[PDB]
């Protein structure tokens, strides 16, 4: 295999799709629970690691390549959402977070 557009083409449209789901959110006003939002984006990744998971007809070479790609990418479109939530909602009515505070 080595690389098929196939595969990139799918990794691509996933890694785009949740880039649009974790921007999507309402970073403006800082309310609701956090677990709220944090399971939220657990929940979607399950989700889409699960389905990700029966969408490959290839070797378990190909399968555990993209499956591991997958998951790395997830981890590093959902850090910046994740990070950047934390930061947010603890940010308003208290900078905790950088340099000024300890």
Do not use: C
């Amino acid at each position: 295999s080595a690389l098929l557009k196939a595969n990139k083409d799918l990794i691509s449209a996933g890694l785009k799709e949740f880039s649009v789901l974790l921007n999507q959110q309402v970073f403006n006003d800082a309310l609701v629970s956090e677990e709220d939002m944090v399971t939220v984006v657990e929940d979607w990744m399950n989700f889409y690691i699960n389905y990700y998971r029966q969408q490959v007809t290839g070797e378990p070479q190909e399968r555990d390549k993209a499956l591991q790609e997958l998951r790395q990418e997830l981890n590093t479109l959902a850090n910046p959402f994740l990070a950047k939530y934390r930061d947010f909602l603890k940010s308003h009515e208290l900078p905790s977070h950088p340099p000024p505070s300890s």
